[model samples]
Every structure is written in C-alpha cells, then in structure tokens.
Target: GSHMAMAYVIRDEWGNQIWICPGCNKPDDGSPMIGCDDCDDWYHWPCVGIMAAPPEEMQWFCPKCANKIKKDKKH
Candidate 1:
C-alpha cells in the first residue's frame, strides 16, 4: 500500500496532550484518518464536515489549503 497516514501530537492551552480529528476538531475515535499533502495534516473523512470519501486524484488538499490556493490564485 502506497498510502501512508500522518500523525501528530497536539497540546492544549495548558499543555494538555490531545489527539484529535483535524476536520471535526474533536477527539479521535479510532476511525480512519487521512493525510493531505497540501494541508500537511491528518483528517477524518466523516470529520471533514462532508462525510464523504476523498476524490480519486494524485493529490489531495484540505479545506484550508483549498481556500489558500483560491486566494493565492487571485492575488
């Protein structure tokens, strides 16, 4: 499998450790997590606010990166 998932550690305001879904911004629930080349973060499909699988393409970008790309294109 060429698919490699990314993971990271997050700290809260008081330095409390947290492992969360980037999409829903909630604690992970042992669900599938994907990494985006553009956003450089791991996100859950259901947590993405769309509850859909990723598109079939060479690259994938998160909402933030998509917005960034759109903004950069116009600038």
Candidate 2:
C-alpha cells in the first residue's frame, strides 16, 4: 500500500465491477485499464467477452493478446 499511480480494470468473481492487477491480479483500484508498472501489457476486460459464457458469438480477444495470438490477423 504505497502511492501507486499505475492503474487497471478487471472484473471480480461475481461479474461485478472490480479492479485487479494487470500483472498479479491482486484486486487493483485507481489503476489504469491498460499497462502496469510491473508489465507493459494492456487488456480490455469486456473485449475478452463474458467469461464462462458462449462469448455471444465466440469472438473474444483483447487487443494485444488477439494481435499476438494470430500475427497475420490485421488488428
């Protein structure tokens, strides 16, 4: 518990709004929705689509993860 200027957003176990570490998932708060002081990666919680669900149409992928998974996909 120091003054952490870094930020991120990730839902919790109940599908309600929750903040989590992009690097460690330790329940983040006042964090950015992208990147972290620990890692330079980003994620859109919603972009991944609803978890444990059919993904609506199964087109689930965050920006970087999706780009990295299929390099030729043309993000």
- TM agreement with the true structure for every prediction: 0.51, 0.25
CA lDDT, every prediction? Answer: 0.61, 0.46
Could you give me the TM-score of model 1 versus the true structure? 0.51
Candidate 2 TM-score, true structure as reference: 0.25
Q: Which stretches of candidate 1 lie over 4 Å from their true place?
A: 1-19, 49-57, 71-75
Clashes of each: 0, 5
Q: Model 2, 1-75: lDDT tens per residue?
A: 755645554566787656453434545444334332223444433434434334334444454455565667653
Cα deviation at 29, candidate 1, in Å, is 1.1
Report the poorest 10 consecutive residues by lDDT, candidate 1.
1-10
Error of 1 at 32 (Å): 0.5
Report RMSD for candidate 1: 9.7
Judging by TM-score against the true structure, name the best candidate.
1
